[PDB]
Amino acid sequence: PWVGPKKGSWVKILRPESYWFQQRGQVVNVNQKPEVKYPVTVKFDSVNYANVNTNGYALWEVIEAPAPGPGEV
Amino acid sequence: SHAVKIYDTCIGCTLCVRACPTDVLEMVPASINAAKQVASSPRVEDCVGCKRCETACPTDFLSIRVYLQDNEETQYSLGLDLVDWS
Amino acid sequence: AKPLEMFGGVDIDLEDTPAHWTIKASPVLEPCKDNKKFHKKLKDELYKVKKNQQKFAEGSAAYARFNKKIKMIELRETAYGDRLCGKKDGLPRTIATGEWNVRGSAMWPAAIFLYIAGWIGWAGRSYLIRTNDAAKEINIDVPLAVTCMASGFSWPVAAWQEIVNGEMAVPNDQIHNGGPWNQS
Amino acid sequence: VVAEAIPRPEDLLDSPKFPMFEGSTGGYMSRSTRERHAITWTAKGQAKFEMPTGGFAIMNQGENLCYFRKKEQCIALGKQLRKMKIENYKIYRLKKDGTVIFMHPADGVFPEKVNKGRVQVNGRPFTIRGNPQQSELKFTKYQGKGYEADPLTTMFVKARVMAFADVPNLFALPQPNMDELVPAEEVDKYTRQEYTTRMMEALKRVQDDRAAKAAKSL
Amino acid sequence: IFRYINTTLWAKAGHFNKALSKGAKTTTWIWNLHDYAHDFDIQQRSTGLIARKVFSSNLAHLSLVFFWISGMHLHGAYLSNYDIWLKDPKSITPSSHLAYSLIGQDILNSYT
Amino acid sequence: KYGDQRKFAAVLVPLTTLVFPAVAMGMFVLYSFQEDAFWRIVPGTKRARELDEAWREHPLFANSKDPLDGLINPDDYEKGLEEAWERAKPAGSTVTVKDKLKQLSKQNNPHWESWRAMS
Amino acid sequence: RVPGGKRTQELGLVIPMADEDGLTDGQVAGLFVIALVVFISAMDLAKTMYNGINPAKFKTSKGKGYISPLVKRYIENGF
Numbered sequence A: 001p002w003v004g005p006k007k008g009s010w011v012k013i014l015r016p017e018s019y020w021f022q023q024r025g026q027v028v029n030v031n032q033k034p035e036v037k038y039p040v041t042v043k044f045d046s047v048n049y050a051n052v053n054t055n056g057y058a059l060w061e062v063i064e065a066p067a068p069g070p071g072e073v
Numbered sequence B: 001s002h003a004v005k006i007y008d009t010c011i012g013c014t015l016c017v018r019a020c021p022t023d024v025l026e027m028v029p030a031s032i033n034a035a036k037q038v039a040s041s042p043r044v045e046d047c048v049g050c051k052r053c054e055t056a057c058p059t060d061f062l063s064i065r066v067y068l069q070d071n072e073e074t075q076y077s078l079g080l081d082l083v084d085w086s
Numbered sequence C: 001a002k003p004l005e006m007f008g009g010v011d012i013d014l015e016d017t018p019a020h021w022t023i024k025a026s027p028v029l030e031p032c033k034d035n036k037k038f039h040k041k042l043k044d045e046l047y048k049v050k051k052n053q054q055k056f057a058e059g060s061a062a063y064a065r066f067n068k069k070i071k072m073i074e075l076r077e078t079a080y081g082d083r084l085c086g087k088k089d090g091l092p093r094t095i096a097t098g099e100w101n102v103r104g105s106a107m108w109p110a111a112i113f114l115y116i117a118g119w120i121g122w123a124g125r126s127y128l129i130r131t132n133d134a135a136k137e138i139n140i141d142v143p144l145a146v147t148c149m150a151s152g153f154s155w156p157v158a159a160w161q162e163i164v165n166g167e168m169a170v171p172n173d174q175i176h177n178g179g180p181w182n183q184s
Numbered sequence D: 001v002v003a004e005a006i007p008r009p010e011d012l013l014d015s016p017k018f019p020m021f022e023g024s025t026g027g028y029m030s031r032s033t034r035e036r037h038a039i040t041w042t043a044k045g046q047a048k049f050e051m052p053t054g055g056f057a058i059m060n061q062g063e064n065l066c067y068f069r070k071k072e073q074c075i076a077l078g079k080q081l082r083k084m085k086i087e088n089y090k091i092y093r094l095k096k097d098g099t100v101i102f103m104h105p106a107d108g109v110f111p112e113k114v115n116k117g118r119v120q121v122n123g124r125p126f127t128i129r130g131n132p133q134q135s136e137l138k139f140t141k142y143q144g145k146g147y148e149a150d151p152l153t154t155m156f157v158k159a160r161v162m163a164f165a166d167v168p169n170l171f172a173l174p175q176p177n178m179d180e181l182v183p184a185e186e187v188d189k190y191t192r193q194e195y196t197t198r199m200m201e202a203l204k205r206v207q208d209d210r211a212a213k214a215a216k217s218l
Numbered sequence E: 001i002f003r004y005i006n007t008t009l010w011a012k013a014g015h016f017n018k019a020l021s022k023g024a025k026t027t028t029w030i031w032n033l034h035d036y037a038h039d040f041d042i043q044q045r046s047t048g049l050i051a052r053k054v055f056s057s058n059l060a061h062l063s064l065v066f067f068w069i070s071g072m073h074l075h076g077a078y079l080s081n082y083d084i085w086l087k088d089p090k091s092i093t094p095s096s097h098l099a100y101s102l103i104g105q106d107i108l109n110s111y112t
Numbered sequence F: 001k002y003g004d005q006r007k008f009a010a011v012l013v014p015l016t017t018l019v020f021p022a023v024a025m026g027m028f029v030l031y032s033f034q035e036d037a038f039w040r041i042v043p044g045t046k047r048a049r050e051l052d053e054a055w056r057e058h059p060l061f062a063n064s065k066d067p068l069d070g071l072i073n074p075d076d077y078e079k080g081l082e083e084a085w086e087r088a089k090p091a092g093s094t095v096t097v098k099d100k101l102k103q104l105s106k107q108n109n110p111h112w113e114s115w116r117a118m119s
Numbered sequence G: 001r002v003p004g005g006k007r008t009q010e011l012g013l014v015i016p017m018a019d020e021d022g023l024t025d026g027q028v029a030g031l032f033v034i035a036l037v038v039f040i041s042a043m044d045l046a047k048t049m050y051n052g053i054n055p056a057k058f059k060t061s062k063g064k065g066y067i068s069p070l071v072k073r074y075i076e077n078g079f
C-alpha cells in the first residue's frame, strides 16, 4: 500500500522555515520505510540560497496541491 | 564554547563532518533517514565557529545549527595561538 | 488688520469663495508676462549670452550658434509668459492641484507617464507570464518580447479586467509569506 | 586504541621522526604557550607537503611527527595528508604536565565514517523551527537559551501556547488573602496529603462563587 | 584551424567557466559571469588556451589604445583650435573638444 | 573682583580631571584582576553561584527555574495523561507515558553551561 | 574679548561681566557640604546596586520582615 503523495504529483510545502513554504514542487520519490521521519522528496524550480532545488519533507508537510500554472509559484 | 546542535532533518550527508576544520562533528548510526546515520557534535569545545558545517548542509534549513556565544569564548573557540589559557 | 504683519510676512486670502480655489487666484503667484523678476532674469540671460557672443568674430560659426541661442532664449521668454510665477522669484511654477487647464499643469505629464509606465510594466509582466522559464530571461525570445511590447497598449483595460476577474492577484496562501515568527 | 608516548616538544630536540621542514616564525610561540598539539603519521614516500605554519616540508619514508600550537593546524595537516591517501594519522593534545590526550580519530575511525557505539550528542528530535520561543522560557533554566531546551519542555511550552489563546475558558488565579493568611512558618498543620484536598475544596468554592457572580448580569 | 572560430558560443553566455554551466538560476550568476570574464586561469581548457587568451587580449587592448590615439588625432585635426594655438600659444587655451548645442549644453563651450 | 573663584578652580579642575581619573583608571585595572570582576555579565564567577544558590534557598524561589513549575497536583496531571494515552495507544504499542516523559526530559547536551565548574 | 561671527560685530552685541564676585566662598562651601552628602549617598547606592538584593537575609538578619498594610491591599487588589 503506497503511502504519501504519488510520484510526480505536485505538493504544497507546509514547513514554515522552508525556503519554499507555501510553494509547490514535484514529488521525486517517497520513502516507504515507516522508520523514516522525512520520507517525501520534493524538487523545485526555484533554488534556495544554497543553490539546492530539492529537499526531503515529512509526511505532514505536503498537501498535494494542483499544478502551478502560468506565472505562479 | 559555542553550541552546535543537530536536528532530526539530517540525512547523513557527512558533508558537515568533512567541512569541520577542528573535528567537532562525527557520524553516528540512526534510523530516521535512508542513510541510517545522523551527525553529532560531541566536541563543540573545539568549535571555533567558522560555520562551514552550515555552508555544507544541503537540507532546506540547516539540520546542523551553530549558535555563537561571545560571552562564552574559550581559548579553543577563539583559536588562540600566541597565548595559552592553560 | 494687516494680516501680512500679523503672521510675519505671509498674507492670507481672507475670502471664502469657490472662485479662489484655482491656483491662478493665489496672491503668492502672478502671470510671468507682467512680473518684474521674470523680466529681470530673462533680460540678464539675454545680456550674458549676448556678451559672450560679442567676444567672438562676427562672421564665425560661433556667432551664428549664439544668434540661435538668443532666439531660443527669447522664444522661451515669450512662451512662459502665460505660466504663473511667484511675485518675488520670477521663476514659473508647476501646478499640482489637478487643474487640467492651466499652463504648466502636472496633470498632462502625470497622465502620459502613468499610461506609458503601465504599458512598460504590463509588457514585462506579460512576457514573464508567457515565458515561465529562466532560460527565456537571459536569452530573450525577441519575437515574443516585441509581441508583448506592442500588446501592452491596452493595459488600462486588460489589467482592470484581470483585477476584477481574479487573474492578477494571488491568494497569500500560494506565495511565501515570509520568515516564521513562531512555532515552539 | 592505544595512545602513543608523544613526549613534550621541549624535551624531544633533534628527533628522527621530524620531517625535513624549512622552519618559519609561524611555529608555536614558546616562552608563552605550554599546550601543544602533535600529529603523527606513517608515509610511504618522501612526498613534499605544506606546513600549516608557513613553509614546506618533506615527509619521512617511515614515521613522522609534528608539533603545533592549535588543533586546527593539526586537522588542516591531517586533511592535507588524507588528500595524499595517507590514513592512520593520529592527533594528540599535549597538556602542560605532558599528559597525552588522543583527539582526532577518537575511536580509531574517522568521523565521516559511521562507527558503532557512537551516540548522537547535542541532538534535537524536531525540525530547527521546533525550538521553543525565547519569550516563553524567561527566568527559567533556559532564560536566553531556547535552543537548549529538552524536548519535553518544548512540548510543554507548546501546549501552554495552545492553551493560552482560548481566553474565555481560562481560569483566573484567585488573589491571595495576605492579611489573614501568612502566619509564622512554624504555624502549619502538616498533613501534606490533606493540603491537596484543601486545595481541591477551596478551588471548588472559588469556581462556584465565580459562576454565581457571573450568573447575575450575563 | 580557423574553422573552430564559431559564433555558437556568443549566445551561450558564461561558457568560459564551468561553474556557470548550470545556467542563470539567480542574479548572482550575472555578476559571476562578469567577474570571471578575464580570469583566464580558472576558465575551461588547457594551459595553452591561457597563453593564447592572454597574448590576444594584450593585442586587443593595444588596438584599443591605438584607437584612442587615433581619436585624439582626429579631434586635433578636425575639432580643434590647434591652428591659432600654433600661431599664438600664450593667448589661446588648447581645445580639441566641443559640445553639441542640446539642453543648453552650449553653455559648456567657452571662448578659447 | 570677578575672579577669586579661580582659587576653587585651581584645585578642583586639576583634581577632578587628572587625579580622580587616574585613580579611577588604576582602581579599574586593579578591579579587573579580582575574582569578582564583572560578576554580573562574565560567566563563571563565584558571586554568581552564591547569588543563584541564595535565591534557590528562599522558600518562594525553590522551584522557580523549573519550566514545568505550576502543576498543583502533578499526580493528577500524569494520571489523566496516561488515561488519555491508553485510549489512543497504537495497537500493541509498548511505550508507557512515564518512561516516554522520562526519556523526553533527558537530552544529551554536555556542553551547556559547562562554565559552572571553575568558580 | 575678541568677538567672532558677523552678527556680534555688526550689531555691537556685548557680554557684560559683573565686577563683584557672584557667590562668596562661604556659599560655595555650603553647596559643597551638600554635594559631599550627595556623593557619599551615591557611592552607597552604587554599592547596593552592584551587590543587588540578598534573599538569604532571612536566615541571618534579625527581625521578621514587614509588608505595609497598603502593600497587602495592592497585592490582593490585582495586578
Ligand code: CLA
Binding pocket: C106, C109, C110, C111, C113, C114, C117, C118, C120, C121
Ligand atoms: C519624466 C520624467 C520621469 C522619470 C525619468 C521617472 C522615473 C520613474 N518613475 Mg515617475 N513620474 C513622472 C516623471 C518621471 N518619472 C511624473 C511626471 C509623474 C506624475 C506625478 C510620475 C509618477 C510616478 C509614479 C506614481 C511612480 C513613478 C515611478 C517611477 C520609477 C519607476 C519607472 C517605471 O515606471 O517603471 C515601469 C513600471 C513598472 C516596472 C511597474 C508599473 C508601476 C507604474 C507606476 C504603473 C502603475 C499604474 C497603476 C495602475 C496606477 C497607480 C496609481 C497610484 C499607485 C500612483 C522611475 C524611477 C514608480 C516608482 O518610483 O515606484 C517605486 C511609481 O510608482 N512615477
Ligand code: CLA
Binding pocket: E034, E035, E036, E037, E038, E039, E040
Ligand atoms: C595590466 C593590468 C591588469 C591586468 C591584465 C589584470 C588582470 C586580471 N585581474 Mg587585475 N587589477 C589591476 C590591473 C590588472 N588586472 C589593477 C591596477 C588593480 C587594482 C585596482 C587590480 C585588481 C584586481 C582584483 C582585486 C582582482 C583582479 C583580478 C584579475 C583577473 C580577472 C579580472 C577580471 O575578470 O575582471 C573582469 C573585469 C571587470 C570586472 C572590469 C569592471 C570595471 C571595473 C571593475 C570598474 C571600473 C570603473 C571605471 C574605471 C569608471 C567608469 C566611468 C564612470 C564615469 C561611469 C585578471 C588576471 C581578479 C582575479 O580573480 O584575479 C585572478 C580579482 O579578484 N585584479
Ligand code: CLA
Binding pocket: F005, F006, F008, F009, F010, F012, F013, F014, F016, F017, G028, G031, G032, G035
Ligand atoms: C552636572 C554637574 C556638573 C558639571 C558637569 C560641572 C562642570 C564643571 N564644574 Mg562644577 N559644580 C557643580 C556641578 C557640575 N559642574 C555643583 C553642583 C557645584 C556646587 C558644589 C559645582 C561647583 C564647582 C566649582 C566650585 C568649580 C566647578 C568647576 C567646574 C568645571 C571644571 C570641572 C571640575 O573640576 O568641576 C569640579 C566640580 C565639583 C567637584 C563639584 C561636583 C561636581 C558634580 C556635582 C558631579 C556631577 C557628576 C555627574 C553625575 C556625572 C558622573 C558620571 C561621570 C563620571 C561621567 C566644569 C565646567 C570649576 C571651574 O573651573 O568652573 C569654571 C570650579 O572652580 N564646579
Ligand SMILES: CC1=C(/C=C/C(C)=C/C=C/C(C)=C/C=C/C=C(C)/C=C/C=C(C)/C=C/C2=C(C)CCCC2(C)C)C(C)(C)CCC1
Binding pocket: C109, C110, C112, C113, C116, C117, C120
Ligand atoms: C520623457 C518624458 C516623459 C516620460 C518619461 C518616462 C516614461 C520615464 C520613464 C522612466 C523609467 C521607466 C525609469 C526607470 C527607472 C528605473 C530605475 C531608476 C531602477 C532603479 C533600481 C534601483 C534604484 C535598485 C533598487 C534596489 C534593489 C535592486 C532592491 C534592493 C533595494 C535597492 C533600492 C538597492 C514625460 C512624458 C512623463 C514628461 C516629459 C519627459
Ligand SMILES: CC1=C(/C=C/C(C)=C/C=C/C(C)=C\C=C\C=C(C)\C=C\C=C(C)\C=C\C2=C(C)CCCC2(C)C)C(C)(C)CCC1
Binding pocket: C096, C097, C098, C117, C118, C119, C121, C122, C125, C155, C159, C160
Ligand atoms: C489627484 C491629485 C492628487 C492626489 C492623488 C492621489 C490621492 C492618488 C491616490 C492614489 C491611490 C490611493 C492609489 C492606490 C492604489 C492601490 C492599489 C492597490 C494599486 C494597485 C496597483 C496595481 C495592482 C498595479 C498593477 C499593475 C498594473 C495595472 C500595470 C503595471 C503592472 C502591474 C501588475 C504592477 C495630488 C494630491 C497628488 C495632486 C493633485 C492631483
Ligand code: SF4
Binding pocket: B006, B009, B010, B011, B012, B013, B014, B015, B016, B017, B038, B039, B053, B056, B057, B058, B059, B062, B063, B064
Ligand atoms: S551536512 Fe547537514 S544533512 Fe548532511 S550529514 Fe551534516 S548535518 Fe546532516
Ligand code: SF4
Binding pocket: B004, B019, B020, B021, B022, B023, B024, B025, B046, B047, B048, B049, B050, B051, B052, B053, B054, B066
Ligand atoms: S562551526 Fe566550524 S568548527 Fe564549529 S562545528 Fe561547524 S564547521 Fe566545525
